[PDB]
Amino acid sequence: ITGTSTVGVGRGVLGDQKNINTTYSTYYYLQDNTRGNGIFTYDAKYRTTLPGSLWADADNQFFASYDAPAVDAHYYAGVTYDYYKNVHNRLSYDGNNAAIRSSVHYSQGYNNAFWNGSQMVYGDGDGQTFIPLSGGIDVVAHELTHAVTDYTAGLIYQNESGAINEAISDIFGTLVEFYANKNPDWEIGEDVYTPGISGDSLRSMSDPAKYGDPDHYSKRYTGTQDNGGVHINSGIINKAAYLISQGGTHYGVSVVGIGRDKLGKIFYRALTQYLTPTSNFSQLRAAAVQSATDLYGSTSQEVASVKQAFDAVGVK
Numbered sequence: 001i002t003g004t005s006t007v008g009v010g011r012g013v014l015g016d017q018k019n020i021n022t023t024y025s026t027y028y029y030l031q032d033n034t035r036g037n038g039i040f041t042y043d044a045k046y047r048t049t050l051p052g053s054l055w056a057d058a059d060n061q062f063f064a065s066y067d068a069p070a071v072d073a074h075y076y077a078g079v080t081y082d083y084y085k086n087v088h089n090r091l092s093y094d095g096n097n098a099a100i101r102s103s104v105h106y107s108q109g110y111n112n113a114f115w116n117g118s119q120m121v122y123g124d125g126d127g128q129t130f131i132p133l134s135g136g137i138d139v140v141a142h143e144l145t146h147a148v149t150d151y152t153a154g155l156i157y158q159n160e161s162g163a164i165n166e167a168i169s170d171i172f173g174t175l176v177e178f179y180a181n182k183n184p185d186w187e188i189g190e191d192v193y194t195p196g197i198s199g200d201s202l203r204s205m206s207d208p209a210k211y212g213d214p215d216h217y218s219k220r221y222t223g224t225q226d227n228g229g230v231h232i233n234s235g236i237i238n239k240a241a242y243l244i245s246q247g248g249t250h251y252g253v254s255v256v257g258i259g260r261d262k263l264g265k266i267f268y269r270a271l272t273q274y275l276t277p278t279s280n281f282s283q284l285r286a287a288a289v290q291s292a293t294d295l296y297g298s299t300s301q302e303v304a305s306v307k308q309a310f311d312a313v314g315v316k
């Protein structure tokens with residue numbers, strides 16, 4: 001809407017206080033005009049109609065329990081925007097400052113979040129498997145990264161190309177979590193998953209097998225569930241990305257780590273310059289090798305480490 005930019009204050013899903021960019025016109029709206037063509041957060045009101053209504057608040061204070069998922073969806077969308085702009089010189093998900101829209105309170109007891117082709121959508125969880133999923137910065141950045149992928153490589157959401165799609169979202173979700181520097185790790189969704197169980201998460205990038213996901217191409221799932229295992233076989237690529245950044249020896253193959261920043265540069269270049277809608281794992285390896293060569297040189301440690309990491313997970 002048309003109005004003046006304001007700064008509200010509220011509490012997120014985990015009880016932390018943060019400032020949020022709002023817009024005043026009669027009400028205070030979750031509309032951040034400081035980033036691109038805006039970040040807009042909507043109330044789906046426990047229904048499945050999208051986007052719902054632009055979030056309106058009478059006093060610019062967002063401390064009610066019902067407000068918490070909206071605060072975090074709005075704030076973490078901003079952090080993710082900042083990561084892509086400051087780190088990769090990318091202006092929003094389309095590179096042209098497209099408005100970023102999110103809806104919270106989607107459905108009832110909904111244990112998921114997604115990008116629907118046009119916007120981000122967050123369930124509240126059932127209180128047992130999940131609390132409201134926008135409480136996870138890695139979750140928010142994972143979802144917005146799907147938008148980046150759709151506008152760049154366009155990886156089809158099935159089989160190997162879909163597992164790469166998923167891994168790209170886990171990689172950049174994790175790099176955004178490190179960028180914000182609040183309890184960062186290489187696991188996915190730990191801040192909103194199973195409030196009754198400490199130390200778990202949906203997936204691990206450093207040890208995908210911790211939660212049953214493959215860490216080597218020979219262990220890949222080839223059935224039809226989960227669009228051909230997109231959230232399962234992502235573990236193979238997530239492990240390679242972890243090894244590239246942090247190093248390690250995996251199935252007897254040693255990888256010299258090169259750090260998170262170079263991981264991000266290599267995979268961002270691969271995603272935006274070399275990957276295609278039907279890229280498979282072998283083609284991802286080639287794209288990462290070429291990207292590392294462009295950035296650091298053919299004889300660089302960075303190129304050597306990309307090759308070792310894909311060797312370690314059985315991807316040639």
Ligand SMILES: Cc1cc(CNC(=O)O)n(C)n1
Binds near residue numbers: 112142143
């Ligand atoms: C309805 C729905 C939920 C999810 C998981 N979200 C994700 O992987 O970002 N998907 C792909 N589709």
Ligand SMILES: Cc1cc(CN)n(C)n1
Binds near residue numbers: 233
């Ligand atoms: C990873 C994967 C899954 C399938 C079949 N659904 N293929 C051929 N590859």
Ligand SMILES: [Ca+2]
Binds near residue numbers: 058063
């Ligand atoms: Ca209020």
Ligand SMILES: [Ca+2]
Binds near residue numbers: 183191
């Ligand atoms: Ca964390």
Ligand SMILES: [Ca+2]
Binds near residue numbers: 177185187188189
């Ligand atoms: Ca995490």
Ligand SMILES: [Ca+2]
Binds near residue numbers: 200
């Ligand atoms: Ca938990």
Ligand SMILES: [Zn+2]
Binds near residue numbers: 142146166169
């Ligand atoms: Zn995803």
